Design a protein around this ligand. Structure first.
Ligand SMILES: CS(=O)(=O)Nc1ncn(-c2cc(F)c(COc3ccc(OS(=O)(=O)O)cc3)c(F)c2)n1
Ligand SMILES: OC[C@H]1O[C@@](CO)(O[C@H]2O[C@H](CO)[C@@H](O)[C@H](O)[C@H]2O)[C@@H](O)[C@@H]1O
Ligand SMILES: OC[C@H]1O[C@@](CO)(O[C@H]2O[C@H](CO)[C@@H](O)[C@H](O)[C@H]2O)[C@@H](O)[C@@H]1O
Length: 467
């Protein structure tokens, strides 16, 4: 039997709910969908809806009742969604749709995307103090999954991740960043699944643990053992590092090919992550890291050091591997239920129903060796994928994805973020789900609105005109 929500987490929740209740209520973001077989007809429906919402009767109906009525039409091949806070934004967005013009709150396509979405599970550098807290208090599905992971992590490591999420005075270190982002990744994807969505394939960059869960390669319990074992070993190892044993990590604007020649001058550098066509994260002794940084800056290339005294995906991980091996005994790798672009295995693809991959050796190899991220993405583009959806508290890896997709010739990919610092977390997920609908991916747009309890919940337009 699993541990429950701790007493301190309940105390922090009550206080956060009082802070929330005393705050300035903000208008929700509402998705208004129009569609038709022909784009020209879709454009006319948008202009007709805009005319009606400008009338006194349309002005008197809530955005939510308008969007609920729209959610019940036939959903045609040519689709658009206007995301709006008030009637003025809605009408303006609908004029854009009718005019075939672009606007920040408007998505409009002539037809569905041909291949299903790639879920991107990264996470490095995405953390911030209050990540996940707002959505936890305001979304019961997300909350339920956060609490489920909070219980497994309590059982594995002996502390509550929910306490960290709810206590604004606490911040994240190397260990707690990984397990908390994992919990947020699990809960974000299950929230999406609750509304009908699903990955055609996953790709990881920790995020590998959560990718294994959503690919059906491990149970939630064994994915949690994977992230817990790696996280606490890395945090405890990094904390004992001083002096000649410190190893830095840095981003440099070199491609894999340039790195090969550049490294001939720096015998102890290794590649941590091939992140984008000309962005590589390297690691090694501080004197050599500073020198490659100075070389890149002298060549007009950007370079940036990260905050860590240890370098994962380098030989410095060798002391941890034996203990990682011991802690992961008992996990049960299963056959994947969607595709996997494995950045541990050089970016290659594993098909749904393939042989399992997520055994103990996988997690050792992943922790010790380079992450072939840009290779996995390029493999996804080359096999027809155009929609990439990142589950994260901040869309860091989507910026890397955009660089690879453009470089592989795909200049209009669908790059869908989820949460973002200083963006309303509930509004962000409305947007994520509206985009999945517009491009034709699995999503039940009716579940974006509560069930109607009376006629005031509908608007006097098709298909719910009042008789
Ligand atoms: C104003 S600017 O343009 O100069 N700043 C700027 N530009 C691009 N940036 C950037 C590029 C990146 F590829 C990454 C990802 O970096 C990782 C580092 C370790 C890592 O390790 S792992 O997850 O364990 O595999 C995984 C990923 C990043 F976080 C930032 N930053
Ligand atoms: O929530 C803001 C407000 O609550 C107080 C107690 O009234 O502190 C609570 O919330 C803090 C922020 O998460 C926690 O760190 C603290 O433990 C909790 O009691 C106030 O001090 C704070 O201003
Ligand atoms: O065209 C069907 C296709 O569209 C999606 C959203 O992309 O679902 C929409 O259409 C369904 C009716 O065909 C509705 O049930 C649903 O509410 C609406 O979102 C996909 O899920 C579906 O495959």
């Amino acid at each position: 039997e699993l541990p429950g929500v701790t007493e301190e987490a309940l105390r922090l929740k009550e206080a956060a709910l009082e802070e929330l209740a005393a705050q300035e209520v903000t208008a929700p973001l509402v998705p208004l969908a129009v569609s038709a077989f022909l784009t020209s007809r879709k454009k006319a429906a948008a202009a007709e809806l805009a005319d009606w919402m400008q009338s006194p009767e349309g002005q008197a109906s809530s955005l939510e009742s308008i969007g609920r009525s729209l959610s019940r039409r036939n959903h045609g091949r040519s689709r658009a969604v206007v995301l709006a806070h008030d009637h003025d934004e809605a009408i303006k967005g609908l004029r854009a749709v009718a005019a075939g013009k672009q606007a920040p709150n408007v998505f409009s396509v002539d037809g569905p995307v041909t291949t299903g979405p790639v879920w991107v599970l990264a996470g490095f550098g995405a953390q911030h103090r209050k990540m996940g807290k707002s959505l936890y208090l305001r979304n019961e599905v997300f909350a339920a999954w956060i609490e489920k992971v909070d219980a497994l992590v309590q059982d594995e490591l002996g502390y509550s991740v929910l306490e960290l999420i709810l206590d604004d005075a606490q911040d994240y270190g190397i260990e707690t960043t990984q397990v908390t982002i994992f919990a947020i990744q699990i809960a974000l994807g299950e929230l999406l699944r609750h509304h009908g969505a699903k990955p055609a394939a996953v790709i990881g960059q920790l995020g590998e643990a959560a990718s294994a869960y959503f690919a059906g390669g491990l149970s939630l319990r064994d994915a949690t053992r994977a992230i817990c074992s790696r996280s606490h070993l890395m945090g405890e190892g990094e904390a004992m590092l001083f002096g000649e044993y410190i190893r830095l990590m840095a981003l440099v604007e070199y491609s894999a090919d340039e790195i090969r020649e550049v490294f001939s001058d720096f015998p102890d550098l290794e590649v941590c992550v091939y992140a984008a066509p000309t962005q590589t994260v390297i690691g090694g002794p501080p004197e050599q890291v500073d020198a490659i940084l100075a070389r890149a800056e002298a060549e007009g290339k950007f370079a940036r050091k990260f905050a860590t005294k240890g370098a994962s995906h380098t030989s410095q991980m060798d002391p941890l591997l034996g203990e990682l091996t011991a802690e992961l005994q008992g996990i049960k790798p299963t056959s994947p239920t969607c595709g996997i672009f494995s950045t541990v295995h050089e970016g290659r693809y594993i098909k749904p129903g393939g042989e399992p991959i997520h055994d103990v050796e996988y997690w050792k190899k992943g922790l010790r060796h380079s992450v072939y991220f840009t290779h996995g993405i390029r493999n996804a583009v080359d096999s027809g994928h155009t929609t990439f959806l990142e589950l994260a508290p901040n869309p860091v890896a989507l910026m890397q994805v955009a660089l690879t997709t453009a470089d592989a010739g795909l200049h209009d990919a669908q790059l869908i973020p989820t949460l973002a610092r200083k963006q309303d977390e509930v509004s962000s997920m409305v947007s994520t789900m509206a985009q999945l609908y517009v491009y034709g991916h699995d999503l039940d747009i009716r579940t974006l609105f509560s069930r109607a309890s009376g006629p005031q919940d509908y608007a006097n337009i098709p298909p719910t005109r009042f008789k």
